[PDB]
């Protein structure tokens, strides 16, 4: 059978500076044949591809801050930042690379606490607002090629019956 | 010294279609890496497509592409390939490249990705016997409701972005 990742909580709701914990479970044992626990931390952020943080559990990969730290065995891991920065938040995906099929969790949204109105905004430094402003632009062209995807779509079936007469 | 990882070939396709997806490396010995291909579905799940040893010897598929995907690559090109054939619906995603570091992890860098959307299996029934003034008129209408939705999209995230300016001007 197919390992299943299952991660938790859905969603993490955080203030900078914060500390963050999330969890990931798998369906069974995922010790790789040749010993090693192929379990790997990704980041991804809107519109954007994954980023590697951490893979065989513990380790950091390259250019990761401290802040960031993976532990586990068995069945029970777990990701945890320190001190949470602007530049963390997005969807952490925990991924199993030792039993074929390889597969995925289904994901974790690290969030802001941003109230009922935009007062959070305001504790933030200029920098970090400038990398939120940015970070738009990717999820906006994303959203626009799905719509342009969409169009192709509904115009190929009058293509082919305008070409079929 | 500059990693690079370009995917290229997506698009549109039928049920049962087909598409070749490229992916052109550079900034690192391509040939010393196997390589694979990882989906993002529509619903933000990620599924490992495909993966492929740094010589070609080896190949990898779950079973959910075997038999109808095949990964490819040209290390004298610095090119990665998926062959996807007998395409099905679930298979509408964004497609990325990504290199691995063999024994260590499995997904080291990352391209930005390159779109297939597999297309409905009907719409077509309707559309046949209809005149060509009205397929023809039905092709015009459709760019302006696109443009619209496009539009429409650059008026929601320029609603996203004001508070964000708001607080940069209140500094």
């Known amino acids: 059978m197919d390992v299943l990742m299952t991660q938790t909580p859905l969603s993490l709701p955080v203030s900078l500076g914060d500390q963050a914990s999330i969890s990931c479970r798998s369906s069974q044992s995922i010790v790789h044949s040749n010993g090693n626990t192929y379990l790997e931390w990704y980041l991804q952020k809107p519109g954007q591809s994954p980023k590697l943080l951490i893979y065989?559990?513990?380790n950091r990969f390259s250019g990761v801050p401290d802040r960031f730290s993976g532990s586990g065995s068995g069945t029970d891991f777990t990701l945890k930042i320190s001190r949470v920065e602007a530049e963390d938040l997005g969807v952490y995906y925990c991924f199993q690379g030792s039993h074929v099929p390889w597969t995925f969790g289904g994901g974790t949204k690290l969030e802001i606490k941003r109230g009922s109105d935009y007062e959070f905004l305001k504790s933030w430094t200029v920098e970090d607002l400038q990398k939120r402003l940015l970070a738009l632009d990717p999820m906006m062209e994303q959203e626009i090629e799905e719509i342009r995807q969409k169009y192709q779509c509904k115009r190929q079936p009058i293509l082919d019956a305008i070409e079929a007469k | 010294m500059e990693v690079q990882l370009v995917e290229s070939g997506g698009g549109l396709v039928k049920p049962g279609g087909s598409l070749k997806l490229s992916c052109a490396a550079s900034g690192f010995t391509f040939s010393s890496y196997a390589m694979s291909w990882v989906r993002q579905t529509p619903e933000k799940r990620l599924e490992w497509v495909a993966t492929i040893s740094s010589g070609g010897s080896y190949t990898y598929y779950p079973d959910s592409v075997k038999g109808r995907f095949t990964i490819s690559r040209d290390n004298a090109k610095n090119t990665l390939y998926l062959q996807m054939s007998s395409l099905r619906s679930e298979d509408t995603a964004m497609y990325y490249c990504?290199?691995?570091?063999?024994?260590?992890?499995?997904?080291?860098?990352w391209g930005q990705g390159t779109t297939v959307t597999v297309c409905s299996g009907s719409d077509y029934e309707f559309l046949k016997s209809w005149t060509v003034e009205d397929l023809q008129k039905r092709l015009l209408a459709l760019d302006p409701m696109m443009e619209q939705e496009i539009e429409e999209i650059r008026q929601k995230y320029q609603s996203k972005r004001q508070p964000i300016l708001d607080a940069i001007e209140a500094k």
């Open positions: 065989k559990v513990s």
């Open positions: 990504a290199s691995a570091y063999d024994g260590s992890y499995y997904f080291d860098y």
